[PDB]
Amino acid sequence: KLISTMPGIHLSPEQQQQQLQSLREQVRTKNELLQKYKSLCMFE
Amino acid sequence: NHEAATCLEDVVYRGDMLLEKIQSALADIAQSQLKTR
């Protein structure tokens, strides 16, 4: 049972949800910025 | 010399516009990267 307390999770599941949502928003905004500069040419 | 002056002015104007655009773009990238933190 101690060896199955080892795994790798320690935060409350609310904190896991907060981390997952924040990281989802991060990947969204970074992909949106990179797509903006994919589409935008400052020159003609 | 007048004609060469206006020609130099035109090429400087195009370069200035392109520089201001790339400068503002780099500033926006820096703002996004600092806001993500």
Binding site: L34, Y37, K38, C41, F43 | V11, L18
Partner: peptide, 19 residues
């Protein structure tokens, strides 16, 4: 000016290849 333009272009040519 030309060099700067093509420089910007190839970096833009790099970025959808990351996307």
């Amino acid at each position: 000016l030309e060099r700067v333009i093509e420089m910007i272009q190839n970096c833009l040519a790099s970025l959808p290849d990351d996307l």
